């Protein structure tokens, strides 16, 4: 894998820790640029707990790298994502995913 590029800076001090809930807004696009998912569209932040394997490896590591209040672009390879199987109907097999992720707060 996962590559992180800081779109906007964060506090730079608070970072997610294992077993700590992370609240984010994400917009997911395929490497071609086609959008397939976005929490801003649903208007509800996505909350997930690190270390529980609730999200894929790319989210795990990339969001662990990000700091509170930071907006970043995450590039996640197929191996670090749904991979060969993919997500039938949404993500084509063997696809790289690009996510615009803002880490709102930690709870």
């Amino acid at each position: 894998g996962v590559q992180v590029e800081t779109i906007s800076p964060g506090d730079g001090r608070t970072f997610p820790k294992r077993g700590q809930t992370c609240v984010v807004h994400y917009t997911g696009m395929l490497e071609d640029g086609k959008k397939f998912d976005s929490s801003r569209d649903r208007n509800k932040p996505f909350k997930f707990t690190l270390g529980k394997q609730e999200v894929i490896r790319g989210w795990e590591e990339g969001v662990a790298q990000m700091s509170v209040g930071q907006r970043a672009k995450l590039i996640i390879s197929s191996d670090y994502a749904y991979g060969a199987t993919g997500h039938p109907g949404i993500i084509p097999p063997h696809a790289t995913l690009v996510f615009d992720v803002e880490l709102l707060k930690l709870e």
Partner: protein
Amino acid sequence: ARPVTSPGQHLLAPEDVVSCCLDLSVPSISFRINGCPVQGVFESFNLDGLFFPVVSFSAGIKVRFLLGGRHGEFKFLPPPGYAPCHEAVLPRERLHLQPIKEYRREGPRGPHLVGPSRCLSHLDFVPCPVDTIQIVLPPHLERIREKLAENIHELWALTRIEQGWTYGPVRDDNKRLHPCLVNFHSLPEPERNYNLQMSGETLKTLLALGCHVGMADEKAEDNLKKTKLPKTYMMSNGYKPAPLDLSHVRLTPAQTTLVDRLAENGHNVWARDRVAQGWSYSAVQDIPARRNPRLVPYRLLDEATKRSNRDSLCQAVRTLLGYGYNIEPPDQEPSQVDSQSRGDRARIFRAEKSYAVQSGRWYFEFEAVTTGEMRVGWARPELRPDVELGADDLAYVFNGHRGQRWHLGSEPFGRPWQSGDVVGCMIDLTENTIIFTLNGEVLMSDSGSETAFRDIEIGDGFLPVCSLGPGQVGHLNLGQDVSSLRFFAICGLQEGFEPFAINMQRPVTTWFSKSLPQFEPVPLEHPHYEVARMDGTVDTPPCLRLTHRTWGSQNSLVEMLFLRLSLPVQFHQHFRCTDNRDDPEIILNTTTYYYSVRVFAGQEPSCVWVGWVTPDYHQHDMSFDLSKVRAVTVTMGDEQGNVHSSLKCSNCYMVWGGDFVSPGQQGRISHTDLVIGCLVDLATGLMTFTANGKESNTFFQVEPNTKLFPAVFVLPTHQNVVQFELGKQKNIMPLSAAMFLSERKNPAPQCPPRLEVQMLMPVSWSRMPNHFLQVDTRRAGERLGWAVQCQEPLMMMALHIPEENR
């Protein structure tokens, strides 16, 4: 979007100062963020036009333009040699923030529809004085020149002393001291030589314009006397202006029209000389830097300076008349600007097709804010955007710029409007008639009939329609608020006519003729162009042939034709790192695809361009050559030198047939057909061309994931023009394999029904958004600069065609 490295990278956030610098010499565009260099530049871009600062945005921003001087306080000093942009405001305009190519504008009574704007060209700033070097001054005019220089200097000094200029050793505006305020013979050599040259230039341009000048009275020269001037007009050194009196002389209107041309020519010659010397234009005068406020071509010059020059030249011609030389104005000669095609020049706004009315009596109003070219009336739903309103049978309109009624031609009708006049358009479909009223009075034809049109067949229906020429503004009132109509009560209410949108709970949707060229399928009934789908024989692949139906006949249409195949080939997301029988493994494993274009004998290859176009090509250029192609190099580098990437981006990749034309064959009609093959490697992003089986030097490189449409730009020269051959070569797959997934491993050439030829159409109907972003622009202050604010969100649901990326 190409990422560019900069210290502390982040998306534009509050308290960020973006400094943009344009160097037109390289040419290059460079950026600085908070005073830190942005490690990336644009360069080698097209210079066919005028550049302006621009900021694009969605709702939810507040930004400020800092243009230097009094219109903005630069936070960071401009890089050496770069001028503040506020210096580029033209003499006749005041600096302000404006939208770009708006077709709609808010108004007091309601929204205003706006026609296309007139844009200056980069060539409009090139002074073009008439060629006078060929003319040789007759001696009688030479002697008059000798005195004309002095007399012009006398008038100059008279004006200077009248406005308060006084003599001095050095020239300074505040001191009001002028060194050249001396006798002409005592004038410094350079200025005196320039004055003599200009005085001779006046006579020489008089001759050049076609005017005739010839001595009439010798005694007039001896009769002329210089006017005595008072001691106040007498100069500190002792010099006195001595302009010869011309109270007796009189000027004809034609002579004044000629004086206007003389002043324009003189100013243009002066501007050309100063440009040659190295001067340039600036809103603020800087003599040490060779920047002048008046160094612009005459047409763009300020009104006051124009009047001053006209007065000077009128006095000069008066001096010639006083000397007695008869001057014969030359007759005006016809001249047509033909700047743009009239059919596509005017923007047409119509009601949506679903609002067409097939019965009843309907009324609406059109207020003409300007007095220029505007048409208003009723159009049928199938109205074409390229054709002018009323030129065909689709629309019945009124053009009150000159007072004509337009339907299948123009006839005199009514009278022209002035500014603010309201034209009420009325359609009675029970009587099949159309009526036009100006300011509540029914316009009458020459015969005296009240109805403008008669015996109208209902057909599909009728829709309100207007057409605005360049620079015109009109307010269309469809009557949703009946009290808003100004003359409905005076005329129309009692006659039973009803407002068009009287009982409509929402504003009527409108469609305007957008002038963005678009690729559309060739019509199956096109009068001039025919496309034939030919099956692939044993020795021939599938083909799409273009033929000119009307070649070599009256009404034939010969113009540049831009053609593309409907389906694109898309390059792979990731590029590879670093007999005549196909080999079963190479053909299956190859990523190269090939398609050819056959230019038929009799079609000049010099008029054919063959290649590919991205989904972004929108140039309907009548005079097209490869120089017109858009192209820009984006260069990423390190914080010091060390260029890292030099990518080139363009929308058109093509080769000219003149390159493959043999030098001996050039200038002669060729019996042979010319086959230009194009190969694309979808894995390596490399594009190559072959001519008659010979590799060409031209080659192109494209970034991964690029979409490319096979394309041909041709100026027809024969009944048979070109043929898209969708074939293949040894170990190169056909084009259908790239286009279609199901045929990705099929080496047999195919031309499925979806694949077809499409031609570039100049204009197309486009829906006008019901709501528009509210942008507030205002000058915050002398130091704060100008300010743009947009705070109210506005969204739309967009339907996207995957293949066309539109």
